[PDB]
Amino acid sequence: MGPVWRKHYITYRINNYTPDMNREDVDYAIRKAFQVWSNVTPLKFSKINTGMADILVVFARGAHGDDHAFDGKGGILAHAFGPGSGIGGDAHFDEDEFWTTHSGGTNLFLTAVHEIGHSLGLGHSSDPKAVMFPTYKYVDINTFRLSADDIRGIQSLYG
Ligand SMILES: NC(=O)[C@H](CCC(=O)O)NC(=O)c1ccc(-c2cc(-c3ccccc3)cs2)cc1
Ligand SMILES: [Ca+2]
Ligand SMILES: [Ca+2]
Ligand SMILES: [Ca+2]
Ligand SMILES: [Zn+2]
Ligand SMILES: [Zn+2]
């Protein structure tokens, strides 16, 4: 076992917003990506705007203060730290991508589902249909479902 949150109530804060999307569409995409994971575990997520959030969502570019710089458009789309205090849990999105609500550019909701997986403690899947597969794939958002391998992974950590 990798690190896991020791509690089932987890807060998140959106540190800043990409100018690529409307603020409301970023909030929705993030809220829906947490909901994917809450639907198969005992976890609950609440958004705060001040105070001490466990998972900070950041948009940043290039070398942005942790050891893992971003690489411009393409390649690394985002990354996240596993459960822990401070930077633990935090999910950072490369502003050099073009974030969207749809199939164009890079879909924020799907990328956030994957990154939130890492923020909760998952590694990668070798199942091509699992959201935790190492490479991005757009899949129809309205019918999106976690694969059984994703659900096995997250239920092996939280129950
Ligand atoms: N390519 C990279 O270097 C980074 C490394 C950081 C990480 O692995 O989080 N990876 C990504 O940027 C990244 C990888 C996968 C995904 C996504 C995979 C899927 C997906 C959906 C259905 C089936 C398979 C994958 C949607 S987003 C998003 C970003
Ligand atoms: Ca944190
Ligand atoms: Ca990039
Ligand atoms: Ca951008
Ligand atoms: Zn980072
Ligand atoms: Zn990943």
XYZ file of C-alpha atoms and ligand atoms in Angstrom:
193
model
C 0.000 0.000 0.000
C 0.903 3.543 -1.037
C -0.264 6.448 1.218
C -4.015 6.892 1.908
C -6.056 9.651 3.525
C -6.794 8.693 7.136
C -10.280 10.290 7.100
C -13.280 10.195 4.863
C -14.061 13.887 4.733
C -11.678 15.649 2.302
C -11.710 19.286 1.355
C -10.435 20.878 -1.837
C -9.797 24.430 -2.916
C -9.380 25.817 -6.377
C -6.304 28.031 -6.091
C -6.773 29.710 -9.416
C -8.577 29.327 -12.690
C -7.428 28.829 -16.235
C -8.376 31.714 -18.572
C -9.196 28.981 -21.147
C -12.654 28.204 -19.589
C -15.430 30.092 -17.794
C -14.956 29.932 -14.022
C -18.294 28.199 -13.618
C -17.249 25.471 -16.089
C -13.996 24.842 -14.099
C -15.953 24.558 -10.887
C -18.449 22.122 -12.486
C -15.702 19.991 -14.117
C -13.855 19.653 -10.776
C -16.969 19.002 -8.687
C -18.082 16.245 -11.175
C -14.609 14.650 -11.137
C -14.668 14.383 -7.331
C -18.226 12.951 -7.599
C -16.957 10.090 -9.751
C -14.798 8.879 -6.915
C -17.236 9.638 -4.083
C -19.846 7.484 -5.913
C -17.783 4.263 -5.232
C -16.222 4.938 -1.863
C -17.142 6.312 1.616
C -15.264 9.565 0.748
C -16.993 12.958 0.722
C -15.468 16.100 -0.780
C -16.307 19.652 0.030
C -15.047 22.827 -1.742
C -13.709 25.628 0.487
C -12.441 29.053 -0.582
C -10.325 29.871 2.401
C -8.836 27.893 5.268
C -6.926 24.659 5.041
C -7.910 22.424 2.134
C -6.461 18.935 1.749
C -6.403 18.938 -2.068
C -5.376 22.201 -3.733
C -6.177 22.479 -7.453
C -3.641 24.735 -9.287
C -3.094 25.840 -12.871
C 0.583 26.581 -13.522
C 3.224 26.482 -16.194
C 6.786 25.371 -16.584
C 8.768 25.210 -13.307
C 6.136 26.057 -10.716
C 7.704 25.399 -7.355
C 7.755 21.672 -6.868
C 10.320 19.271 -8.233
C 8.376 18.414 -11.336
C 8.284 20.990 -14.000
C 5.763 21.095 -16.764
C 6.786 20.900 -20.473
C 4.667 23.318 -22.561
C 1.844 22.286 -24.798
C 1.349 18.526 -25.030
C 3.212 15.817 -23.161
C 2.498 16.150 -19.393
C -1.055 17.511 -19.057
C -1.215 17.500 -15.246
C 0.158 15.781 -12.165
C -0.784 15.144 -8.558
C 0.764 14.234 -5.298
C -0.484 11.284 -3.301
C -2.182 11.668 0.134
C -0.205 13.614 2.780
C -0.005 16.972 4.436
C 1.105 20.156 2.641
C 1.653 19.521 -1.037
C 0.258 15.980 -0.526
C -2.949 15.558 -2.426
C -2.471 18.592 -4.568
C -3.316 18.453 -8.263
C -1.610 20.739 -10.732
C -2.739 21.319 -14.309
C -0.376 22.576 -17.084
C -1.672 25.945 -18.220
C 0.215 25.453 -21.519
C -2.605 23.050 -22.453
C -5.923 24.341 -23.775
C -8.478 23.214 -21.172
C -12.009 22.592 -22.312
C -15.455 21.272 -21.455
C -15.490 19.054 -24.546
C -13.419 16.940 -26.959
C -11.273 19.818 -28.257
C -7.972 20.707 -26.611
C -7.687 18.720 -23.360
C -10.828 17.860 -21.444
C -10.509 19.199 -17.890
C -13.122 16.855 -16.320
C -11.428 13.676 -17.589
C -7.970 14.879 -16.681
C -9.223 15.795 -13.230
C -10.771 12.337 -12.711
C -7.345 10.856 -13.392
C -5.446 13.288 -11.245
C -7.908 13.029 -8.381
C -7.222 9.271 -8.538
C -3.589 9.966 -7.809
C -4.541 12.551 -5.067
C -6.490 9.672 -3.411
C -3.567 7.294 -3.646
C -3.934 5.332 -6.953
C -1.146 4.496 -9.315
C -1.552 3.675 -12.937
C -3.606 0.910 -14.519
C -2.540 -1.295 -17.407
C -6.177 -1.548 -18.547
C -6.768 0.687 -21.603
C -10.337 1.281 -20.535
C -9.354 2.418 -16.996
C -9.238 6.195 -16.359
C -6.001 5.453 -14.516
C -4.290 4.262 -17.754
C -1.137 6.429 -18.247
C -2.258 8.328 -21.301
C -5.064 10.642 -22.033
C -8.077 9.551 -24.015
C -11.168 11.556 -24.683
C -14.258 9.433 -24.059
C -17.808 10.619 -24.235
C -18.373 12.640 -21.059
C -22.070 12.099 -20.769
C -21.687 8.324 -20.545
C -18.278 8.260 -18.777
C -17.854 5.417 -16.272
C -14.948 4.254 -14.106
C -13.755 0.767 -15.182
C -13.896 -2.161 -12.883
C -10.185 -1.921 -12.465
C -10.488 1.726 -11.222
C -13.208 0.705 -8.813
C -11.123 -2.238 -7.518
C -8.192 0.061 -6.969
C -10.060 2.768 -5.064
C -12.111 0.302 -2.959
C -8.875 -1.472 -1.994
C -7.801 1.816 -0.332
C -11.104 3.128 1.161
C -14.019 1.230 2.519
N 1.793 12.055 -19.645
C 2.387 12.426 -18.405
O 3.585 12.531 -18.368
C 1.524 12.689 -17.180
C 2.132 12.164 -15.917
C 1.270 12.566 -14.749
C 0.157 11.587 -14.477
O 0.409 10.495 -14.970
O -0.749 12.126 -13.829
N 0.223 12.072 -17.307
C -0.885 12.889 -17.663
O -0.689 14.055 -17.877
C -2.254 12.290 -17.855
C -2.413 10.929 -18.055
C -3.684 10.407 -18.275
C -4.790 11.234 -18.266
C -6.038 10.734 -18.570
C -6.281 9.393 -18.918
C -7.852 9.211 -19.336
C -8.473 7.898 -19.755
C -9.815 7.815 -19.867
C -10.349 6.579 -20.286
C -9.455 5.499 -20.578
C -8.062 5.700 -20.453
C -7.657 6.921 -20.044
C -8.499 10.453 -19.288
S -7.414 11.614 -18.803
C -4.624 12.596 -18.120
C -3.360 13.113 -17.896
Ca -2.498 19.210 0.193
Ca 2.331 19.918 -21.074
Ca -4.156 27.251 -21.256
Zn 3.334 20.601 -9.805
Zn -1.285 9.501 -14.017
